Design a protein around this ligand. Structure first.
Ligand SMILES: CCCCCCCCCCCCCCCCCC(=O)OC[C@H](CO[C@@H]1O[C@H](CO)[C@H](O)[C@H](O)[C@H]1O)OC(=O)CCCCCCCCCCCCCCCCC
Ligand SMILES: CCCCCCCCCCCCCCCCCC(=O)OC[C@H](CO[C@@H]1O[C@H](CO)[C@H](O)[C@H](O)[C@H]1O)OC(=O)CCCCCCCCCCCCCCCCC
Ligand SMILES: CCCCCCCCCCCCCCCC(=O)OC[C@H](CO[C@@H]1O[C@H](CS(=O)(=O)O)[C@@H](O)[C@H](O)[C@H]1O)OC(=O)CCCCCCCCCCCCCCC
Ligand SMILES: CCCCCCCCCCCCCCCCCC(=O)O[C@@H](COC(=O)CCCCCCCCCCCCCCC)COP(=O)(O)OC[C@H](O)CO
Ligand SMILES: CCCCCCCCCCCCCCCCCC(=O)O[C@@H](COC(=O)CCCCCCCCCCCCCCC)COP(=O)(O)OC[C@H](O)CO
Ligand SMILES: CCCCCCCCCCCCCCCCCC(=O)O[C@@H](COC(=O)CCCCCCCCCCCCCCC)COP(=O)(O)OC[C@H](O)CO
Ligand SMILES: CCCCCCCCCCCCCCCCCC(=O)O[C@@H](COC(=O)CCCCCCCCCCCCCCC)COP(=O)(O)OC[C@H](O)CO
Ligand SMILES: CCCCCCCCCCCCCCCCCC(=O)O[C@@H](COC(=O)CCCCCCCCCCCCCCC)COP(=O)(O)OC[C@H](O)CO
Ligand SMILES: CCCCCCCCCCCCCCCCCC(=O)O[C@@H](COC(=O)CCCCCCCCCCCCCCC)COP(=O)(O)OC[C@H](O)CO
Ligand SMILES: CCC[C@H]1CC[C@H]([C@H]2CC[C@@H](O[C@@H]3O[C@H](CO)[C@@H](O[C@H]4O[C@H](CO)[C@@H](O)[C@H](O)[C@H]4O)[C@H](O)[C@H]3O)CC2)CC1
Lengths: 202, 176, 488, 125, 100, 143, 49, 115
């Protein structure tokens, strides 16, 4: 583990401030950049000193997410039980857009959900997918530019790589409790080990 | 125009040992104040080396400018750091330092296998005509003044522009 | 005395003396008068950067000469590069005056730093000595450290300045160590066309200490050009610096470093061509491979343009590698001239989009065609020219670069260049794919509240002098080379 | 081969076994030739080049004269030694007149050193 | 004489400075190690001017210019350090990895 | 000793006009151009051989003529006297081809040159032979 | 099988690009160490061997 | 020689404090105690160990001093060669002094030299 992150230098000092703007609060509280109707060229109103491009600062400093991808495995029951997690994402991150990847049966569950933007059908149970369909889904996920991706499917090396190629800042997944999930946590920002080989047993 | 031979070699060895001690103090001290004070020893030893070779003006310029630099460095290290922290005292060792120690040892070995294999005295006897000084220029600082004023005119004004712009940028960036 | 010998030699650097006079006049007026006016600063920066070209074009037909006692060489090769530096500064001043004014910061200091970096870039183009091959890029690198952290308040700019200062102190000291090794094992010679003779005079042209100097010089120069693993300074600095300064450092730094690399690998290092040829081949192959592969996995526009720049530099390196025989240096220019317009247009569109929008993420570029079709069209044209798409400048520039490579027998380099150019379409097409999304649900609120406003603005003129160039130079690629094969 | 002077001086000083007498006599001859060639640099008042040459040739001679005693027959080995000592003394004087430079005294010591080394070659044969 | 030993020391300094440039957890210390590297380069230049350039003194002039450049860097930072400490109240450079 | 093997055909022979300094020279081709100017950079082509006619250096090996500042002692004394002239030697003109016999005292002297890694490029007390060819005065632009 | 070759090319390109992007770290000390390791490698290649 | 006296004088000047320290060590008694070794704080017990952390605007003259030291170092060789050469070096160093004056004016007007 030292050999992975060389020059670690511990964690951040308690007195670090991370600047002034885009430092505290939530996503809906940011006062800058604001509209400048008096500008003849349509340029916004920016704070003194700060660079013009400020929307990228919240992701680095405050860890804001605007588009989230929840790849929920299972049918109607699991996708229904994932509703409090979706509401939690909406409450914690105001203004976020949540997209769901699930099976054909689980996609119909999100008809009665007020928080999901897109619900997409993808055969997650197939361990050997069609190369064209797999590539199309991966490119779609790459082109949505998800800030964070969560996976309730038990992720091996292949699912970890699929989440890795999503270009998401946070890659969070459930992993296999057995030895076959070795190296999956290297490609994921956060890993969860359930108490059994079946997550729906809970 | 030199010291006696054994005295010259003993001074070389002694100042080299002092320089090694100062550099090791620089790269092994947690406190920027302590490592800055070791840097001052390095500066003094290097100025003495310049005096040893033939450079009586470059040594004085090194002393003046680099002493100003280390004084400013100590001031800004006092001002931009936490408490005095005498307890820090030789920061800890990590793997990330151990790999770079090997890399730097390899680099130093590569340099010293060339220095120890090249006959530097052979080059001196080939550049005979480059060592025939003008008899009128007795003062070495006079030669350095003439060759700074005439041979290098464009860098002499470029460094003035560089210093002015560096002063302006230092004032503008560091202002509250 | 006479003050004449320097007076006649001082007229040779008159285009740089104009820049120095404009710099001093701007500084004196800033100090003297309390009030600040944007139009006067615009006027002084422009008239400093359009009188240097006026004087330089008047000096084009003059005889080549080495002035200031083996310190400044004026010939056909360096004049083109000095003109390129002046063109970059002229097309980057409108990019800077609006951007720094909208950040509510002092702008005379920014113009001073840009003018000094231009002055230190023009001197690097012809720098026929070893001291001024060190002092002049320190007139550029120090200003680049003062820039890219001029924001002074964003937490990104401080880290970018830290990385730039530390990595460029790591370089430009390895470079001077190589200069010391080259100066020592030569007989105390520092003029460019006088140390190969000095090497033979001391018979150290096959010494092991010459290989150290070549490697150190190549490393210190490949830091500034940023090919191959000397590239890591580029993206972070490109991601955490204001857009006009990073555009300047994208176009001005590569021109000066390319000129220095051409004048330091051909004039004083022609006897050991078989070594720096291999070094540059590795430096170019790694650059294209690892600058086009990482750019397709980028979520930020400035960082993607950084990987783009470190990919396109490898195409230009082929011009040094082939040599002056099979064109070569005539293919460095006529592509760097292209590259300047390509990058300055694709950065002007980014400048306007960020100023009117307030973002840098690529995902917020969706639906710009519906809001501003002109800006989307211009950015798409710049990016397609960047990808070497047929009717735009990059395609003819790349086939010119590859014709000389094939003519010199470098099949591997041309094949890697073509494969990386194929890889270099997916990006420069991803942004357009975003730009043509009519889905209102995928459109970010950043561009939903977008006001184009009924005024022209300066950057529009500056990139209308550019977008019409990257498309309409495609017939005029016979006028340019006859000015670039004329140099030798 | 060249047998000496082909690497850095400190490496040949400290990390080399040394020279056989048959190479030491050749180094004596080369030192004498270099001393003969040093006259032009002495006349141009280039004291740094001369002092470097004198120190290097001294460092060569302290080994070579000691290790070339074998080639001298027993009937002359004392007298040769005397000549060797004389040469050292002369070079010392030359040293003393290049550092703290003088023109007349350095020239006098230069001629004395040339005569002493010619006597040393006459003894070595 | 053993003048070449100076070269050895210069090389050592360079490597040591290079080492101190990498393991630096304080950017003031990184600036000091930059001064160390430039000092090693200057030692090489001065001893080479002593060796081969007793008349023109090009190495001494280059050493003066390198000292000037080093002082210009030492003026530009710690002003950059001043901006960083005013904005973040921390100096440790390895802890700032936002741009990655 | 450390001679790099370069295969080159020989030049026409001469009778050597020995001078007071010990240099020998002949005018194979008398140049019609400007004579070698003092304190100026000039490009010449040369083929430096040792005694016993073994070539150790050549500007044709590197592919371009060598540029040196002539007349101010930036080469060996024999080459300067052969090219720039003086002491009974007329200066060479542009396009002129001249043979040169540099004695050891006009060359590297009794000290070997280019010594590193167990060998030296030029031995001690070696007479050198140079087939120099004044290509021209240095100019920034080639045709 | 046949269609797996181009899609496999794209997937491997994506994976290698992501791996090279993520393997560094983004810290300045890592930048300097990687910048200096290849200098050491070049020096060992072109001088020692 | 004019510089062996310099080395001998430097050695003697460095030796003198060593002699003073040795003489004090062999002459003066030692009577150390825990109250004696405490840091002096005008009678009262010192609080936290020293440390002041000045403001930046106070210590911004040092960045001017770094540049001005280099400028005054560069001015010396010109003055040494002012008589051998003529008005050429006068014109050369006039720009140096003018740039120095302009930088001083900038530092004065921007408030860098204000306390
Ligand atoms: C499709 C676009 C190009 C159409 C075919 C090109 C031929 C056009 C006419 C024939 C010809 O020789 O033109 C020759 C032209 C003229 O272009 C240049 O003009 C110069 C005039 O100062 C000189 O004549 C140059 O030699 C000539 O190459 O060559 C081109 O580059 C054609 C495009 C001109 C630019 C248009 C925008
Ligand atoms: C795999 C090669 C070993 C690692 C390496 O060089 O990492 C160093 C970098 C990977 O490091 C990447 O570098 C990027 C710079 O463009 C950014 O800093 C990324 O954040 C960083 O991860 O890879 C190379 O440069 C390989 C050069 C060969
Ligand atoms: C040789 C150079 C190859 C460069 C490949 C780059 C890459 O990663 O492509 C990634 C894309 C993924 O599509 C994906 O398809 C997505 C479709 S959609 O938007 O999600 O609908 C698209 O948006 C996304 O940009 C794209 O990544 O790959 C492809 O679409 C297939 C390209 C295959 C090219 C092979 C060439 C050689 C074939 C013979 C052997
Ligand atoms: C003149 C040079 C004098 C010689 C300096 C070196 C003395 C011998 C090595 C001892 C190490 C030393 O001095 O270290 C100190 C730091 O050294 C310096 O800073 C001195 C060098 C500065 C020289 C300035 C020259 C200008 C403190 O660190 P420590 O680990 O020894 O401390 C133990 C404990 O805390 C009690 O102090
Ligand atoms: C214009 C830029 C500054 C002026 C450059 C040089 C000054 C022009 C006159 C030089 C002549 C000289 O040596 O100064 C004379 C004094 O002239 C002045 O002092 C006039 C200048 C006044 C102010 C200039 C200095 C401050 C700026 C002394 O007279 P002279 O007869 O001894 O010299 C004649 C001959 O040309 C010598 O080379
Ligand atoms: C390629 C050329 C790039 C440089 C010129 C870009 C276009 C500039 C332009 O259109 O003019 C602007 C600049 O106009 C000026 O005010 C300056 C005068 C013109 C400067 C630009 C052109 C200069 C070159 C002209 C030819 C050379 C003239 C000098 C030599 C004879 C308009 O400024 P404004 O009045 O709208 O500014 C208002 C301000 O922002 C409010 O805060
Ligand atoms: C040769 C000298 C040429 C000087 C040209 C300067 C010029 O045209 O005057 C300007 C300056 O004239 C003034 O009104 C200032 C007094 C003169 C300042 C110059 C003195 C130093 C000259 C060197 C114009 O002022 P502005 O209306 O563009 O506003 C500039 C103002 O200072 C800041 O807003
Ligand atoms: C954005 C740039 C697009 C490309 C522009 C191409 C222009 C068309 C092609 C022109 C080819 C003919 C020019 C060839 C060299 C001419 C050399 C010459 O004599 O130039 C004179 C004219 O100067 C110029 O106009 C030179 C500028 C053109 C060359 C450089 C173009 C920019 C670099 C391209 C990259 C010198 O100036 P003067 O006033 O001292 O001479 C008086 C008289 O004209 C001749 O005695
Ligand atoms: C024949 C090839 C025509 C297509 C290639 C081309 O010239 O580039 C662009 C074609 O450019 C144009 O749209 C025409 C206007 C610019 C002119 C560029 C050259 C046109 C063709 C010249 C001859 C070939 C393609 O992109 P776009 O600009 O159409 O992208 C959509 C755009 O944002 C919609 O506004
Ligand atoms: C076969 C394909 C090529 C290659 C295989 C191996 C692949 C990498 C993937 C991941 C990388 O990760 C390493 O682990 C570290 C965690 O500590 C990272 O450090 C982070 O630390 C923070 C989170 O802990 C983040 O904020 C930082 O951005 C990041 O530095 C470190 O980057 C990296 O060393 C190891 C193997 C790549 C594809």
């Amino acid at each position: 583990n030292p050999w992975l992150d060389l020059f670690y230098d511990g964690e951040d000092e308690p007195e670090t401030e991370y600047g002034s703007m885009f430092s505290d609060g939530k996503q809906d509280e940011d006062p800058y950049p604001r509209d400048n109707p008096e500008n003849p060229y349509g340029f916004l109103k920016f704070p003194q000193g700060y660079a013009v491009e400020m929307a990228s600062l919240g992701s680095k400093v405050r860890g804001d997410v605007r588009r989230c991808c929840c790849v929920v495995s299972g049918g109607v029951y699991d996708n229904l039980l994932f509703f409090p997690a979706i509401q939690l994402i909406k409450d914690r991150y105001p203004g976020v857009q949540i997209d769901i990847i699930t099976s054909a049966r689980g996609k119909q569950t999100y008809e009665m959900n007020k928080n999901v933007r897109w619900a997409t059908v993808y055969d997650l149970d197939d361990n050997f997918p069609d190369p064209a369909e797999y590539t199309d889904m991966l490119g779609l996920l790459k082109n949505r530019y998800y800030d964070m991706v969560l996976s309730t499917k038990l992720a091996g090396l292949g699912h970890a790589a699929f989440l890795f190629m999503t270009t998401a800042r946070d890659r969070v997944s459930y992993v296999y409790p057995n030895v076959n999930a070795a190296g999956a946590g290297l490609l994921l920002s956060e890993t969860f080990t359930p108490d059994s080989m079946n997550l729906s047993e809970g | 125009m030199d010291l006696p031979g054994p005295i010259h070699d003993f001074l070389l060895v002694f100042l080299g040992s002092g320089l090694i001690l100062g550099a090791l103090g620089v790269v092994l001290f947690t406190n920027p104040i302590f490592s800055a004070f070791s840097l001052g020893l390095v500066l003094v030893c290097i100025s003495l080396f310049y005096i040893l070779a033939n450079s009586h003006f470059v040594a004085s310029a090194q002393l003046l400018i680099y002493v100003g630099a280390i004084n400013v460095l100590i001031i800004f290290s006092v001002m931009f750091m936490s408490g005095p922290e005498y307890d820090k005292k030789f920061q800890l060792w990590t793997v990330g330092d151990g790999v770079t120690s090997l890399v730097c040892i390899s680099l130093f070995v590569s340099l010293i296998s060339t220095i120890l294999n090249t006959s530097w005295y052979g080059i001196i006897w080939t550049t005979k005509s480059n060592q025939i000084l003008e008899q009128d220029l007795i003062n070495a600082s006079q030669q350095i003044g003439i060759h700074l004023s005439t041979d290098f005119f464009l860098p002499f004004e470029l460094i003035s522009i560089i210093l002015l712009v560096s002063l302006i940028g230092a004032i503008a960036v560091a202002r509250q | 005395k006479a003050f004449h010998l320097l007076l006649f030699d001082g007229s040779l650097i008159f285009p740089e003396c104009i820049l120095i006079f404009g710099l001093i006049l701007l500084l004196m007026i800033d100090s003297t008068s309390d009030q600040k006016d944007i139009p006067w600063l615009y006027f002084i920066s422009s008239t400093s950067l359009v009188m240097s070209i006026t004087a330089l074009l008047f000096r084009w037909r003059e005889e080549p000469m080495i002035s200031f006692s083996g310190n400044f060489q004026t010939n056909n090769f360096n004049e083109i590069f000095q003109f390129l530096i002046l063109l970059c500064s002229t097309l980057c001043i409108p990019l800077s005056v609006e951007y720094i004014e909208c950040t509510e910061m002092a702008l005379t200091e920014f113009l001073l730093f840009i003018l000094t970096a231009t002055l230190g870039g023009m001197f690097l183009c012809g720098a026929n000595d070893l001291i001024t091959i060190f002092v002049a890029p320190e007139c550029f690198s120090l200003c680049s450290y003062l820039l890219s952290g001029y924001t002074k308040k964003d937490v990104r700019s401080n880290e970018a300045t830290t990385k730039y200062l530390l990595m460029g102190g790591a370089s430009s000291s390895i470079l001077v160590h190589g200069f010391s090794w080259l100066y020592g094992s030569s007989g105390g010679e520092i003029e460019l066309q006088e140390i190969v003779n000095g090497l033979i005079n001391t018979q150290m042209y096959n010494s092991p200490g010459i290989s150290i100097a070549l490697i150190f010089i190549t490393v210190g120069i490949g830091f500034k050009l940023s090919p191959a693993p000397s590239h890591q300074w580029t993206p972070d600095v490109y991601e955490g610096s204001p857009t006009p300064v990073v555009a300047f450092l994208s176009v001005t730094s590569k021109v000066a470093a390319s000129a220095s690399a051409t004048r330091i690998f051909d004039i004083p290092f022609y006897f050991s061509s078989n070594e720096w040829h291999l070094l540059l081949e590795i430096l170019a192959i790694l650059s294209m491979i690892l600058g086009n592969l990482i750019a397709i996995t980028q979520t930020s526009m400035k960082r993607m343009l950084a990987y783009s720049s470190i990919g396109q530099i490898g195409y230009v390196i082929i011009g040094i590698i082939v040599g002056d025989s099979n064109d070569g240096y005539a293919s460095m220019i006529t592509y760097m001239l292209f590259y300047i317009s390509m990058n300055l247009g694709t950065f002007a569109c980014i400048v306007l989009f960020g100023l009117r929008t307030g973002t840098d993420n690529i995902r917020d570029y969706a639906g710009l065609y519906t809001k501003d079709p002109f800006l989307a069209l211009s950015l798409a044209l710049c990016l397609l020219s960047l990808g070497g798409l047929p009717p735009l400048a990059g395609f003819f520039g790349k086939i010119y670069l590859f014709w000389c490579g094939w003519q010199a027998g470098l099949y591997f380099l041309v094949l890697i260049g073509l494969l990386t150019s194929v890889l270099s379409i997916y990006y420069y097409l991803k942004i357009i794919k975003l730009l043509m999304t009519g889905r209102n649900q995928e459109i970010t609120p950043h561009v939903r509240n977008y006001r184009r406003s009924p005024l022209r603005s300066k950057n529009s003129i500056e990139f209308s002098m550019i977008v019409c160039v990257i498309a309409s130079t495609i017939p005029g690629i016979s006028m340019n080379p006859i000015i670039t094969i004329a140099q030798d | 081969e060249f047998k000496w002077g082909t690497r850095s001086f400190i490496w040949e000083r400290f990390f080399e076994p040394g020279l056989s007498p048959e190479d030491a006599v050749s180094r004596i001859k080369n030192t004498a030739e270099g001393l003969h060639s040093l006259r032009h640099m002495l006349e141009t008042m280039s004291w740094r080049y001369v002092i470097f040459y004198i120190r290097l040739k001294q460092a060569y001679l302290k080994q070579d004269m000691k290790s070339a005693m074998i080639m001298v027959p027993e009937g002359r080995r004392d007298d040769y030694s005397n000549a060797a000592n004389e040469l050292v003394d002369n070079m010392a004087e030359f040293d003393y007149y290049v550092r703290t430079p003088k023109v007349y005294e350095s020239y006098v010591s230069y001629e004395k050193t040339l005569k002493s080394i010619d006597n040393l070659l006459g003894f070595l044969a | 004489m053993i003048l070449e030993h100076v070269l050895v020391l210069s090389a050592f300094l360079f490597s040591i400075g290079i080492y101190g440039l990498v393991t630096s957890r304080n950017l003031v210390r990184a600036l000091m190690c930059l001064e160390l590297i430039l000092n090693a380069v200057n030692l090489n230049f001065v001893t080479f001017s002593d060796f081969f350039d007793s008349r023109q003194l090009k190495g001494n002039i280059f050493s003066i210019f390198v000292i000037a450049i080093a002082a210009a860097e030492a003026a530009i930072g710690p002003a950059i350090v001043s901006s960083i400490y005013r904005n973040r109240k921390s100096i440790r450079i390895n802890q700032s990895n936002l741009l990655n | 000793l450390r001679v790099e093997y370069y295969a080159t055909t020989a030049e026409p022979s001469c009778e050597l006009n020995l001078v007071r300094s010990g240099l020998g020279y002949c005018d194979l081709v008398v140049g019609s151009g400007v004579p070698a100017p003092y304190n100026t950079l000039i490009n010449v082509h040369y083929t430096a051989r040792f005694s016993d006619e073994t070539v150790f250096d050549s500007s044709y090996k590197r592919g371009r003529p060598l540029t040196m500042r002539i007349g101010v002692g930036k080469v060996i004394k024999g080459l300067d006297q052969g090219i720039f002239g003086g002491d009974g030697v007329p200066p060479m003109q542009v396009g002129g081809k001249r043979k040169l016999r540099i004695p050891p005292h006009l060359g590297y002297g009794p000290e070997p040159a280019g010594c590193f890694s167990g060998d030296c490029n030029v031995p001690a007390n070696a007479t050198l032979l140079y087939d120099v060819t004044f290509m021209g005065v240095y100019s920034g632009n080639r045709a | 099988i046949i269609d797996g070759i181009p899609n496999g090319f794209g997937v491997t390109s994506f994976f290698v690009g992501e791996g090279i992007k993520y393997v560094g770290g983004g810290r300045i000390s890592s930048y300097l160490f990687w910048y200096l390791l290849y200098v050491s490698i070049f020096l060992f290649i072109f001088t020692f061997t | 020689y004019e510089y062996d006296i310099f080395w001998a004088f430097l050695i003697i000047s460095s030796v003198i404090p060593i002699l003073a320290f040795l003489f004090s060590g062999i002459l003066a008694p030692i009577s150390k105690g825990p109250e004696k070794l405490s840091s002096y704080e005008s009678g009262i017990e010192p609080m936290g160990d020293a440390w002041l952390q000045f403001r930046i605007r106070y210590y911004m003259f040092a960045l001017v001093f770094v540049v001005f030291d280099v400028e005054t170092v560069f001015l010396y060789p010109w003055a040494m060669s002012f008589d051998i050469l003529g008005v050429s070096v006068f014109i050369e160093a006039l720009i140096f002094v003018l740039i120095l004056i302009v930088g001083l004016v900038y530092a004065w007007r921007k408030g860098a030299l204000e306390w």
